[PDB]
């Protein structure tokens, strides 16, 4: 019904190996060559990656800033309003970023701010300027 | 199988169905009601049972009838018909059995039988029993032909046929009850020793054997599923097919290696893209940190844009550090995924050169069984006879197989040292010209009604001919002769005066160094209570070794054995014999095989008798006059002793039917 398990035999394979007196030797050598060709390619990338790794040696340890946790507040101080306005100018819609920048205002509080002060801080006009960047 | 069904099975007959042969003789019955057919079958099976139960004595019609219960004994004609039918076709009353009815004093018809090997002897006994005058012409100074034993004192070793391949359905089972052959089973345990003389661990042995079987199964797939049976208008050989299969497995090993290393490169590449991102990201982070410091060093108080700058840069820096930690997480995953692949390469080769040598031992073994190199066997038909194999264990004749022909020859008229040179067959009769082997000038002429030719296929192939047929045989026959294969294989008998090997080890192998020499003394048998070792020469080695002197052959044997049992151990042999079946002018090989370009049908063609043309123009179609038997003439059991025996039984029945006429076909 079918070839014994693990034995591989297609119509296509057979015809190629039997087409002429040394078709097999040709097929096998052409594969030895493809095989050697791909291990050169491995050695090369292994060497490429060894160099790249040694460039990242030390990682980003000297660049970490021990980050503070601090709780929320639903009150807007003048300081915070101005921070937000500038944050919107830099980051646009990105509520998460704006929240992070202000530090003490959740995402929702920020989203609300957008509506409540839309008029007073010409928020639409500011946003169109973020869009030109 | 048991009872009356056991009898059918033991006679190679279907118990519940009538054969083609039976149809021809009992057309009235096979074309009639099912019930009648069942009556016939029972009578047939029962008659066979009575004979098989006691084959040391002639089973007569009267004896048969007396042991059938009603209503089966209520048709005496039918019983008599069945009896004569079985008797004529050799299914009962064959071999050597004490007869009840003495032989007809006046004989009818004259037959010359060429050759006194088992086919010839079996046919002669039958013809004599049927009342014909029979003479056998044998070239050798002995009977039995390719069944040749060797004797010295109590030491006994077969140079020809040696194995009884299972008793279930084998006619030799009947012969073994008639003649006192001492049959002995063959332990299938067979350790192997590599060329260096060290034993093969039974880890490898099993693995390689399994692969060998898998490869055979593979060639069968190539043959039946892909119809790979013709290559460049030439028939494909088993050898060729195996080479293709092996090459494809080697190809697959390389295909897997490639895909494995390609998965490594592909991953290696993802890594380098990620590392590049990381390096660039580290630069950005390093730069932002510097800016964030410059910003944080503007001491307060500070206007809101300055404050915004510090807070803003801080956020951007943390965000980027989060990106870097994610990429570092991915780096550890890819790095480990590589240590995994680097540690798990796919297998290195299809076969280690050691593996290939052991594999070649198995091929040599197959070359020995078929008495020919694998490159000569038909891929499509080499195993055409496998479905007819007998059941039970293989056995050897402890007291020498020659006991069979020697016994079968008792009471027959055999002319030894008489080599047939020419066979003339005409409308009116035949004449056979033969010479005395011991002085060729002495000539003999034998006239007969019919000639039964059991000359070996090897002899029939001889060019120029050893035996001339006048008129020449027709092309349909000669072409069959040219197409079929006739192999070769040899034995080396080593007699010592003391044992030095393991006496419970029945047989063991020597693994050759190269493929070319795989059949050279690859197997050794330790078969008797006596201290004798038999070495086998198979495949391409068989033919070549025949050109080498005994001393050089024996030297090689001793060299091998010294390597296995120790140089100190193995003493010099007391006596040695080397067979050379190819050079033997009366055999010219060992036995037939289905060569590429041939088929089983050729075996049938070898069997078909020849009928000469009319002597007088316008005269009626003659009788057939030239008949053939032999190992090479029986499609289902070729190349064996039982095959030869059956061929003789067949021709005896056909000849007797032709010249004495059937009683039993009304
Ligand atoms: C090495 C070897 C091992 C074997 N092992 C086994 C085995 O283990 N099991 C098994 O079942 N079978 C085996 N066989 C096969 C078996 O021996 C044969 O199939 C069988 O014995 C052949 O019987 P035959 O009558 O057809 O051939 P033969 O015995 O060849 O009968 C032919 C006779 O014709 C004679 N003859 C030839 N030329 C002339 C002439 N010109 N004039 C007169 N007579 C002539 C011959 O010398 C011979 O006596 C083996 C064969 C060989 C060669
Ligand atoms: N059936 C079977 N039939 C056969 C052969 C065979 O080889 N096995 N080979 C040919 C006859 N010659 C021999 C030579 C050697 C052996 C022999 O010694 N064979 C192995 C059996 C091989 C098997 O497993 O089939 C054994 O040790 O019993 C048997 C027949 C033709 N018929
Ligand atoms: Cl001889």
Write out residues 253-292 of B within 8 Å (CB-CB) of A. Answer: 254-255, 257-258, 261-262, 264-265, 268-269, 271-272, 275-276, 278-279, 282, 285-286, 289, 292
The atom of ligand 2 lying closest to the CA of B489 is 14
Contact state of A17 with B244 under an 8 Å Cβ cutoff: yes
Nearest CA in chain B to A62: B286
3-state per-residue secondary structure call for B106-158: CCCCEEEEECCCHHHHHHHHHHHHHCCEEEEECCCCCCCCCCCEEEECCEEEE
Report the C-alpha gap between A11 and A3 in whole angstroms: 12
CATH code of domain B1-109: 1.10.10.10
Find tokens 């009626």 and name the residue: B620
Torsion angle (degrees, nearest 10) of CA A124, A127, A129, A131:
-130
Provide the residue count of chain B: 666
3-state SS class at B410: coil
CB spacing of A35 vs B307 below 8 angstroms? no
Does residue B365 line the site of ligand 2, with CB under 6 A? no
Domain ranges of chain B: 1-109, 110-235+352-666, 236-351
DSSP per-residue string spanning B360-396: HHHHHHHHHHTTS-GGGBBTTTTTTTGGGPPBS-EEE
Helix (H) or strand (E) holding B321: helix B304-343
Between the CA of B482 and the centroid of ligand 2 the distance, in Å, is 25
Q: Distance between CA A96 and CA A78 in Å, rounded?
A: 20
Question: If DSSP codes are grouped into helix, strand and coil, which group holds residue B536?
Answer: strand
Give B331→chain A minimum CA distance, Å. Answer: 10
Q: Annotation-wise, does B335 bind a ligand? A: no
Nearest-angstrom CA–CA distance, B285 and B315: 12
How big is chain A, counted in residues? 133
Any B CB within 8 A of A86 CB:
yes
DSSP 3-state assignment of B38?
helix
Contacts of A82 in chain B (CB under 8 A): 304, 308
B147, B456 contact by CB (below 8 A): no
Residue B165 host element (H or E): strand B163-165
Which residues on A lie below 8 Å from B307 (Cβ)?
Answer: 79, 83
E-strand ranges in B212-327 read 230-231, 234-235
Sign of CA dihedral B29, B31, B36, B38: positive
Contact B39, B2 (CB under 8 A): no
Q: Distance (Å, rounded) from C-alpha B458 to C-alpha B487? A: 9
**CATH number at A1-133:** 1.20.58.1880
Q: Which of B366, B590, B594, B639 is nearest to B490 (CA)?
A: B590
Cβ of residue B248 closer than 8 Å to a chain A Cβ: yes
CA B514 to chain centre: 23
Tokens of B197: 């003389």
Cα–Cα distance for residue pair B534/B524, rounded to 1 Å: 5
For residues B331 and B2, give the distance between their C-alpha atoms in angstroms, rounded to a whole number. 74
* Residue of B228, B270, B307, B312 best to disrupt the A interface, most CBs of A under 10 A: B312
Q: Which ligand is nearest to the CA of B160?
A: 1
Ligand 1 pocket test, candidate residues B161, B370, B434, B541, most atoms within 8 A of CB = B161
CA-CA distance, B520 to B363, in Å (whole number)?
12
Report how far apart, in Å, the C-alpha atoms of A91 and of each of A88, B290, B316 are. 5, 21, 10
Tokens at A80, concatenated: 């915070």
The end-to-end CA distance of chain B, in Å, is 33
DSSP state of B456: -
- Dump the DSSP string for B625-650: -EEE-SGGG-TTSTTSHHHHHHHHHH
Degrees, nearest 5: CA angle B571-B572-B577: 130
Experimental method: X-ray
Secondary structure element (H or E) that encloses residue B254, with its range? helix B238-296
User: CA of A50: which chain B residue's CA is closest?
Assistant: B272
The CATH fold assigned to B236-351 is Helix Hairpins (1.10.287)
| Resolution attained, angstroms | 3.0
Alpha carbons B618 and B529: distance in angstroms, whole number: 67
What is the Cα–Cα distance from B369 to B371, expressed in whole angstroms? 6
Strand B532-537 versus strand B468-470 pairing type: unpaired
Give the single-character DSSP code of A103.
S
């Amino acid at each position: 019904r079918k070839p014994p398990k693990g034995m591989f035999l297609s119509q296509e394979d057979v015809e190629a190996v039997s087409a002429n007196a040394t078709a097999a030797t040709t097929v096998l050598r052409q594969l030895d060559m493809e095989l050697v060709s791909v291990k050169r390619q491995i050695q090369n990338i292994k060497q490429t990656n060894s160099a790249l790794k040694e460039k990242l040696d030390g990682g980003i340890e000297p660049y970490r800033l021990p980050e503070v946790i601090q709780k929320c507040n639903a009150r807007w101080t003048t300081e915070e309003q101005l921070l937000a306005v500038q944050a919107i100018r830099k980051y646009g819609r990105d509520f998460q970023a704006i929240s992070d920048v202000i530090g003490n205002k959740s995402v929702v509080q920020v989203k609300n701010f957008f509506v409540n002060y839309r008029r007073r801080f010409n928020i639409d006009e500011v946003l169109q300027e973020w869009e030109a960047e | 199988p048991s009872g009356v069904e056991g009898a059918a099975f033991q006679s190679r007959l279907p118990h519940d169905r009538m054969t083609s042969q039976e149809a021809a003789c009992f057309p009235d019955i096979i074309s009639g009601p099912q019930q009648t057919q069942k009556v016939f079958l029972f009578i047939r099976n029962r008659t066979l049972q009575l004979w098989l139960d006691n084959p040391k004595i002639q089973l007569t019609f009267e004896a048969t009838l007396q042991q059938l219960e009603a209503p089966y004994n209520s048709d005496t004609v039918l019983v008599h018909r069945v009896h004569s039918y079985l008797e004529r076709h050799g299914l009962i009353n064959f071999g050597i059995y004490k007869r009840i009815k003495p032989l007809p004093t006046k004989k009818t018809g004259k037959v010359i039988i060429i050759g006194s090997g088992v086919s010839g002897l079996a046919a002669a006994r039958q013809l004599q029993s049927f009342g014909m005058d029979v003479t056998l012409l044998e070239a050798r100074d002995r009977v039995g032909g390719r069944v040749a034993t060797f004797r010295k004192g109590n030491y006994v070793a077969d140079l020809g046929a040696m194995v009884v391949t299972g008793l279930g359905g084998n006619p030799m089972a009947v012969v073994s009850k008639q003649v006192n052959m001492e049959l002995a089973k063959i332990k299938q345990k067979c350790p192997l020793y590599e060329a260096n003389g060290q034993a093969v661990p039974k880890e490898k042995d099993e693995m390689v054997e399994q692969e060998f079987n898998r490869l055979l199964e593979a060639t069968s797939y190539l043959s039946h599923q892909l119809d790979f049976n013709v290559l460049n208008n030439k028939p494909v050989s088993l050898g060729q097919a195996l080479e293709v299969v092996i090459q494809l497995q080697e190809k697959h090993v390389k295909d897997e290696q490639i895909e494995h290393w390609k998965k490594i490169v592909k991953t290696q590449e993802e890594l380098k893209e990620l590392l590049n991102k990381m390096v660039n990201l580290k630069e950005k982070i390093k730069e932002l940190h510097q800016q964030y410091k410059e910003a944080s060093e503007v001491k307060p108080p500070r206007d809101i844009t300055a404050e915004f700058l510090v807070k803003s840069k801080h956020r951007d820096l943390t965000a980027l550090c989060k990106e870097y930690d994610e990429l570092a997480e991915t780096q550890g995953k890819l790095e480990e995924k590589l240590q995994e692949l680097e540690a798990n390469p796919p297998s290195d080769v299809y076969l280690s050169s050691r593996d290939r040598q052991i594999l070649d031992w198995h091929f040599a073994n197959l070359e020995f069984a078929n008495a020919t190199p694998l490159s000569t066997l038909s891929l499509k038909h080499w195993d055409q006879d496998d479905d007819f194999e007998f059941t039970g264990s293989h056995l050897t004749v402890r007291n020498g197989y020659s006991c069979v022909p020697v016994a079968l020859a008792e009471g027959l008229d055999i002319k030894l040292n008489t080599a047939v040179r020419q066979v003339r067959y005409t409308a009116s009769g035949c004449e056979v010209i033969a010479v005395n082997t011991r002085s060729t000038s002495q000539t003999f002429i034998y006239k007969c009604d019919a000639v039964l030719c059991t000359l070996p296929l090897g002899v029939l192939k001889q060019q120029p001919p050893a035996v001339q047929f006048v008129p020449p045989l027709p092309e349909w026959k000669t072409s069959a002769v040219q197409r079929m294969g006739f192999g070769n294989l040899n034995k080396v008998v080593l007699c010592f005066d003391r044992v030095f090997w393991d006496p419970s080890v029945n047989l063991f192998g020597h693994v050759g160094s190269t493929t070319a020499s795989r059949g050279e003394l690859f197997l050794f048998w330790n078969l008797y209570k006596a201290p004798i070792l038999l070495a086998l020469v198979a495949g391409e080695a068989a033919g070549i070794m025949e050109n080498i002197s005994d001393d050089v052959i024996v030297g090689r044997c001793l060299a091998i054995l010294k390597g296995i049992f120790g140089s100190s151990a193995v003493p010099q042999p007391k006596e040695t014999v080397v067979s050379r079946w190819r050079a033997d002018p009366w055999a010219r090989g060992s036995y037939s095989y289905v060569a590429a370009g041939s088929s089983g049908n050729d075996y049938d063609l070898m069997a078909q008798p020849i009928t000469p043309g009319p002597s007088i123009p316008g005269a009626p179609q003659p009788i057939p006059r030239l008949f053939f038997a032999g190992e090479h003439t029986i499609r289902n059991y070729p190349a064996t002793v039982h095959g030869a025996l059956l061929s003789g039984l067949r021709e005896a029945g056909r000849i007797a039917d032709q010249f004495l006429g059937a009683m039993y076909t009304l």
